[PDB]
Design a protein around this ligand. Sequence first.
Ligand SMILES: CC[C@H](O)[C@@H](C)[C@H]1O[C@@H]1C[C@@](C)(O)/C=C/C=C(\C)[C@H]1OC(=O)C[C@H](O)CC[C@@](C)(O)[C@@H](OC(=O)N2CCN(C3CCCCCC3)CC2)/C=C/[C@@H]1C
Ligand SMILES: [Zn+2]
Ligand SMILES: [Zn+2]
Ligand SMILES: [Zn+2]
Lengths: 62, 160, 110, 76, 182, 144, 85
Amino acid sequence: IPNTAHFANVTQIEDAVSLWAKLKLQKASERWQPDTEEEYEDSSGNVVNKKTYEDLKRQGLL
Amino acid sequence: QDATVYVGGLDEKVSEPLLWELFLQAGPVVNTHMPKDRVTGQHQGYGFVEFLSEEDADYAIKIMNMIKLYGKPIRVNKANIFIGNLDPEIDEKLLYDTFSAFGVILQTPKIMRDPDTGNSKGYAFINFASFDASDAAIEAMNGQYLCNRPITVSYAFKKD
Amino acid sequence: AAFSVAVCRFSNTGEDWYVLVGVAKDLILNPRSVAGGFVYTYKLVNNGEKLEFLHKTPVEEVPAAIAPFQGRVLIGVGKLLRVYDLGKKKLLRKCENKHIANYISGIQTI
Amino acid sequence: TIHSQLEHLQSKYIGTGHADTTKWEWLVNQHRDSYCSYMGHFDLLNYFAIAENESKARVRFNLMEKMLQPCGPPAD
Amino acid sequence: NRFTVAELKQLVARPDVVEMHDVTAQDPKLLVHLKATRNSVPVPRHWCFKRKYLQGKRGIEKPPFELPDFIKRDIDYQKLHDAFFKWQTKPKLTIHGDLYYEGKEFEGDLSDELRISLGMPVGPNAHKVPPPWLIAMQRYGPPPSYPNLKIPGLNSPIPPLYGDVFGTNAAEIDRTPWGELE
Amino acid sequence: MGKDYIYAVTPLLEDALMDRDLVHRQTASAVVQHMSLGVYGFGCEDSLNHLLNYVWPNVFETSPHVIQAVMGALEGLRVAIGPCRMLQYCLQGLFHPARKVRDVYWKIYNSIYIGSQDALIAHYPRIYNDDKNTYIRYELDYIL
Amino acid sequence: DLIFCRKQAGVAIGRLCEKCDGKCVICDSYVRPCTLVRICDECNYGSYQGRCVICGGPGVSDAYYCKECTIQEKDRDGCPKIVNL
RNA sequence: GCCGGCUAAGAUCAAGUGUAGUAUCUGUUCUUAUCAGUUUAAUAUCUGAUUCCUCGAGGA
Ligand SMILES: CC[C@H](O)[C@@H](C)[C@H]1O[C@@H]1C[C@@](C)(O)/C=C/C=C(\C)[C@H]1OC(=O)C[C@H](O)CC[C@@](C)(O)[C@@H](OC(=O)N2CCN(C3CCCCCC3)CC2)/C=C/[C@@H]1C
Ligand SMILES: [Zn+2]
Ligand SMILES: [Zn+2]
Ligand SMILES: [Zn+2]
């Protein structure tokens, strides 16, 4: 776990690992992840199926 | 220490932002450090330039090696005979190759370094095979024109 | 309840004009509560005299600002700023920022 | 004793605090003078009456009725 | 019946503003929330010290007062008045939240003086006069840290070079302000 | 007439406010107060905020004359700089764990509140509802 | 025991003596008198009719607030007569 | 301040001098120790309890 201002005045191990899990969840949530967060509509039907992720589109266009 | 490059051979015209401005073309020099003396209160000719990447420090060490900056042999590096006022651009193998022309060397020579930076102090010690090579170094090499630095070879210990 | 409107053209399409309307769904003002939101899309045909429904995209908050942007559209969905391209059945989310403080009330672009 | 009189007059004014002020008192004070400021300024009441589609007399009466117990009843 | 630091760090949205004494407040949840407002500079940091806000160290002994440049350059007529109001510059100013404290007072192009001391001549009209660090760049190649840098002889033409400029960085609207005096 | 001369005396006031002598800081606070009340409506807020950054650390002073001058300077800056900045300086100390900080900050806050009680309506920060009580002001969230 | 009266001020005008003539009652400044001082009815009665608001001697001229006190609205508190207990 | 330390880093209790006010100086002592209560943001403070070794003596 990196040393940051968040982990100050924290002296116990399990408290540190739990607060690290919390901070990880928070930050990972608040970023923009294009791989799972994106709306592609492949040209397979070209007028349907807008639920394609960024990976299924490559599999369909391969 | 890997991303920082130790520069040696800086005159009084070189300063702390001047080395960062000269090393800006080689790479992104983030900081410059110059240790001040205690008796004089100025730089001792050796400083450090901490860059962002190690490739920029390698390019600065391969580009600014044995350069003539402010009338001084500035060189960047990765941070019984006595030779004084030697250039920091030479290494132990270079000093052994330069000393091989006069006489035969007994082993690999050693150069003194500063306890803070560790690149070059200013003096070195080399041992010859016999006294004839030491006399040839005191006759010819003691005063020879090195790379923009007048060296001085002397005897470390002599009995009257 | 409609709160935003925009007229623009999309780059992936031709020279057709579109009208986008942002609508809240079951908004209470005091205490504030909303069930969701929608973005309507119309085609604006017959020399700018008729609107014809194309589709209707759901969003999880009131879309309060819509602004054309570089052949696409920016939409403020509550606290979120999103980029949207035109699709065949709905609007396709392309980019998103999640660090705006409270609530987007206006968007302007140079 | 002028400083002490100032410390007694500042306490007298309604809405001032001290080292023992709680969150509830602070928040009800700002809610109450917010409602009074809404009643005073003519164009804020206009904004609210257009937003919620009511007559201005009705918005004024609603604010006066909300004046009594803003932020709910106190603790314990 | 009082939080611990790690327990309160788990409840708040911003744990890095929580401090040692914050768990000893009468309402720590409101305190930490106000410490996270998108403004509101913090407390002067010497409330818990025991040295009366003036540190007796750091060598405060220094020059009394350095007047501005405009100070130096009857006593002076309206022409020197014109000088004092043409030379008047805005000094260095700190923005809204930068409080002072006892400690915070101490903590391709080359100059002409360095080029004169290094023994490098001036730039000619139409010739090749490179610096001694340019031969290594011509032999080994361009530096990967600055690929947009241009040097005369390798990427820039010789007629470029003008004065002390031995390099130029070439990186690969309606910017006029709206209401301004003429 | 002082609106053209605030930039010239700012470094001197900085130096005098960093000084250990008490009369230095008291008189510098008096200067700040008179300068603040002298320029008002003339757009000199930059230098006055800069000088507030040096005046504010003196709020924990026990000497009566120094704290009197500091209060005078703060009430002059309340007029010249605005109550929003003063509330921003008081917010984090209003609920500090130490009683000394709370006393000082509530004195400053009461002085800011008695003058310009109406402006503070637009400056208060958002405070979220808890399980028992409602604290959001919902009318200001309306969007026509 | 230098305390202001701080009662509701009336129509009576405050007075200053020969020694306090140019002074401001609140801050004791001498620059730019701006606003005429008003006092309450118990401060202006009988033997108290004409008296310096600072000291209490025989008044000779009008008491004024300074421009600095007027800008901060310090003329909006009660009667500024200095009263001793 | 000098190259972590050399006890000029703090509190306190008596007396002297003196001012409109702030103050200035001397003796001191500083628990080298533990527990319970008060209290302090935390210290602090205050309120109570608590045979051995050495050469007739000293220390714990
Ligand atoms: C800090 C200094 C002290 O407080 C000091 C003033 C005071 O402690 C002494 C005691 C005592 C009694 O000797 C004081 C003397 C008084 C003075 C020097 C003032 O003079 C007077 O009272 C004269 C009279 O009352 C009114 C003159 C007047 C209007 O010029 C007054 O000053 C002003 O109002 N100003 C200041 C502003 N100034 C500009 C100029 C452009 C147009 C006029 C208004 C703006 C005009 C003149 C007096 C100034 C002296 C400080
Ligand atoms: Zn006044
Ligand atoms: Zn009088
Ligand atoms: Zn009265």
